[PDB]
């Protein structure tokens, strides 16, 4: 039972609007616990979830410095690479960042993660090992080189391995109630005539937690891959999450078709039939 | 809890 | 590798605007303004997280700061009193959280003394 | 509330010997760093050591840290005194965004 802390940044050029937005949110696993905007009123991190609320003014003050600083170097970050892609003042941009760490059920550093995007694409990552970088064009090696000569690796592994495990112990303890829970799908099946000799049979989970799952479509055992339609996990809004995943069957070969569902609330896999 | 602005500089 | 402030000896008269310079040229991002009085610590007056970045000490009344670029970081008393004569530091660092082996490097002092 | 508090405002010492500064403080910070400094008669200021809050103790050169995270305590050990370790050393306080908090300072003679 491993669990997860993760941030997402995103700043947002407006050419005719003024300054750039910026914005940020934290997670710990699939659960929002803080959030950042520059258009907003306050000009304050605040909390997002009721376990964050703790936190003291201290806390609040020095997260809201390290989004303000994040922000200005995000500002000069897109002129920047305005000028490495030969773009225009008149173009808006997109710079993106996601940055966390997972740790094991005992609570000990596992993965770290850091990863940056310019207007919805990759543009440079850390490594697994957070000692190296992947540059994903020629632009991205200028900043692969010069975050070389200024140990930038480092700098981001001493957080990964260091404070940002120690902020996920801290979280997961003071809102332990809510955040080791693990609730199980609740499943079932709709079926809906397509013609007079075609029908969709629909696989339902609900009301699961976390988010992850897997819904696969058997016919007579075999994997179903042919016109399976998936939707994308979506949230209920209270904290669980939904999916759905369809076949259309040929009319009264509904019994040949089975839906599994595998999550980790789930001691076994569920198999569901049309009966 | 935020990773601290520094030695990001594209 | 050094900070350097100027004046490092000041005596002005109450109320006569000053600034007092900090400069190095080690491409530091992190800059930080103390007082220290006789026989105490230092005291945080302002400091500065990056180029275009400041914010608030524990003691930045009758201060100001700028940081328009890297490598310099001015102290500005617009109207300074005698309660502002003091021994002040400007400390750096290549980053506000410094790697294990990395230095936090002080300028020499300044000796402002302010009388009527 | 947030206080460094050195409550040895004099300790002298014999040459070749060990001295321990130590350092409490009080702060609502669950994640920082704590700073050792060095000011000699010149008043120059020197940064010594830095312990983290989440690290083991930290150690460098006759300077090492005894961090006891309960107790916020987070005394200072200069091994083998020399003539020239004669300062006034100051513990700090240091948060994830660049403020700082400093204790008032201990004066450590050495004596020949």
């Known amino acids: 039972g491993s669990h997860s802390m993760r941030y997402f940044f995103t700043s947002v050029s407006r050419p005719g609007r003024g300054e750039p937005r910026f914005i940020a949110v934290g997670y710990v696993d699939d659960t929002q616990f803080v959030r950042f905007d520059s258009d907003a009123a306050s000009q304050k991190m605040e909390p997002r979830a009721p376990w964050i609320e703790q936190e003291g003014p201290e806390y609040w003050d020095q997260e809201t410095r390290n989004m303000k600083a994040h922000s200005q170097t995000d500002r000069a970050n897109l002129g920047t690479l305005r000028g490495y892609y030969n773009q225009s003042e008149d173009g808006s941009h997109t710079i993106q960042i996601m940055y966390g760490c997972d740790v094991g059920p005992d609570g000990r550093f596992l993965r770290g993660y850091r990863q940056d995007a310019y207007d919805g694409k990759d543009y440079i990552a850390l490594n697994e090992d957070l000692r190296s970088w992947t540059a994903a064009d020629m632009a991205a090696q200028i900043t692969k080189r010069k975050w070389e000569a200024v140990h930038a690796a480092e700098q981001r592994r001493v957080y990964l391995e260091g404070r940002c495990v120690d902020g996920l112990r801290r979280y997961l303890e003071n809102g332990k109630e809510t955040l080791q829970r693990t609730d199980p799908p609740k499943t079932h099946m709709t079926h809906h005539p397509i013609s007079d000799h075609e029908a969709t049979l629909r696989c339902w989970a609900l009301g699961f937690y976390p988010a992850e799952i897997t819904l696969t479509w058997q016919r007579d055992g075999e994997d179903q891959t042919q016109d399976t339609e998936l939707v994308e996990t979506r949230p209920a809004g209270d904290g669980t999450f939904q999916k759905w995943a369809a076949v259309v069957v040929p009319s009264g070969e509904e019994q040949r078709y089975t839906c599994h569902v595998q999550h980790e609330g789930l001691p076994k896999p569920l198999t569901l039939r049309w009966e | 809890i935020l990773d601290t602005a520094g030695r990001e500089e594209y | 590798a050094q900070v350097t402030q100027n004046p490092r000896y000041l005596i002005t008269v109450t109320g006569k605007k000053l600034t007092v310079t900090c400069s190095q040229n080690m491409n530091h991002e992190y800059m930080s303004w103390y007082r220290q009085d006789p026989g105490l610590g230092l005291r945080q007056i302002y400091y500065?997280?990056?180029?275009?970045?400041?914010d608030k000490g524990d003691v930045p009344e009758g201060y100001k700061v700028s940081r328009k670029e890297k490598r310099n970081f001015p102290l500005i008393l617009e109207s300074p009193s005698p309660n502002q004569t003091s021994l002040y530091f400007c400390?750096?660092?290549?980053?506000?959280?410094?790697?294990?082996?990395?230095?936090?490097?002080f300028g020499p002092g300044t000796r402002l003394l302010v009388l009527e | 509330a947030q206080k460094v508090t050195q409550a040895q405002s004099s300790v002298s010492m014999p040459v070749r010997k060990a001295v321990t500064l130590n350092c409490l403080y009080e702060?609502?910070?669950?994640?920082?760093?704590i700073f050792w400094y060095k000011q000699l008669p010149s008043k120059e200021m020197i940064f010594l050591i830095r312990?983290?809050?989440?690290?083991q103790n930290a150690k460098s050169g006759r300077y090492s840290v005894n961090f006891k995270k309960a107790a916020k305590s987070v005394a200072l050990t200069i091994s083998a005194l020399q003539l020239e370790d004669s300062a006034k050393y100051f513990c700090a306080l240091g948060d994830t965004a660049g403020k700082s908090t400093f204790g008032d300072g201990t004066t450590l003679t050495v004596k020949p």
């Open positions: 702060t609502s910070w669950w994640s920082y760093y």
């Open positions: 400390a750096s660092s290549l980053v506000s959280t410094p790697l294990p082996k990395e230095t936090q490097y």
């Open positions: 500065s997280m990056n180029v275009e970045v400041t």
């Open positions: 312990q983290g809050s989440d690290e």
